[PDB]
């Protein structure tokens, strides 16, 4: 299963079927036929296979990368430290890509799950999506195909000079 905190969902409230007419619908009979003929054999096969899994339980792990010094506190043209900073920045870049992907998954799931009232009910997911895409665009856009930590730091310094001049001319 997954975490309901990183993938939030509202509680699914279905209404109980109140048939106004007297005619028996084929949906409930096909549902019970699906539950007898299909659901129970698949479930028993999965129970046997899951027992066969649990007869040899063994675990894999999520690899943890400790923080190394970034490109800023690396000396210039010292490949032994800026290599580590570059691999740090590349792993963080790929993880930021997948964070933007998770927010896209939330936005699409909210839009489909709300249906027609999506423009009303998914303003929060749209706002979080706008925040994370604005952050990704300020962080990594227009670096080109030969992107590096140096190019990203140069973009961040140019952005900080523009923001500093904008704040200073305001005061």
């Amino acid at each position: 299963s997954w975490d309901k905190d990183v993938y939030p969902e509202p509680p699914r409230r279905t209404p109980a079927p109140s048939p106004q007419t007297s005619l028996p619908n084929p949906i409930t009979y096909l549902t019970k036929a699906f539950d007898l003929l299909v659901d129970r054999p698949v479930t028993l096969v999965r129970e046997f296979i899951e027992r066969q899994h649990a007869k040899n339980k063994y675990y894999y792990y999520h690899r943890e990368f400790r923080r190394v010094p970034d490109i800023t506190e690396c000396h210039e043209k010292d490949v032994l430290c800026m290599f580590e900073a570059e691999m740090q920045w590349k792993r963080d870049y790929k993880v930021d890509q997948e964070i933007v992907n998770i927010i896209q998954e939330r936005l699409k799931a909210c839009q489909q799950r709300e249906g027609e009232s999506h423009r009303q009910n998914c303003a929060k997911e749209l706002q979080q999506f706008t925040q994370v895409v604005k952050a990704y665009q300020d962080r990594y856009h227009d670096l080109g195909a030969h992107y590096s930590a140096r190019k990203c730091l140069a973009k961040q310094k140019q952005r900080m000079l523009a923001e500093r001049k904008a704040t200073k001319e305001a005061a």
Binding site: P19, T21, L23, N25, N121
Partner: protein
């Protein structure tokens, strides 16, 4: 379809434009005109997933018709009276829109007569 020729081949100063109207106050000619009363609650149609074209001042008959159309399955022809209620209320809303258009036409005729009497007097 007389209004097309009355706006194109006659004069345009007295026929009301479709885009920017009503050009008059709501109570200009109406003493104690009541506001429209909404029947459907906003959350009741937020939970009814209605199209925003359909979230007008008469969507409560549409909510009743959709509850009928869901509940009367498979008998898909057992909801004619709810449909005719909703169509009759749409007909009354269309008649109210026609009354809006005719009110605008008669106020522009009123303005035409007013400016002609002002020109002939002064």
């Amino acid at each position: 379809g007389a209004h097309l020729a009355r706006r194109y081949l006659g004069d345009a100063s007295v026929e009301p434009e479709p885009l920017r109207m009503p050009t008059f106050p709501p109570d200009y000619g109406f003493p104690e005109r009541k506001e429209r009363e909404m029947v459907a609650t906003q959350q009741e149609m937020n939970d009814a997933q209605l199209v925003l074209q359909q979230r007008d001042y008469c969507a409560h008959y549409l909510i009743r018709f959709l509850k009928c159309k869901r509940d009367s399955f498979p008998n898909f022809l057992a909801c004619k009276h709810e449909q005719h209620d909703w169509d009759y209320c749409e007909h009354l809303d269309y008649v109210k829109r026609m009354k809006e258009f005719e009110r605008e036409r008669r106020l522009l005729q009123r303005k035409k007569r007013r400016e002609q009497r002002e020109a002939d007097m002064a």
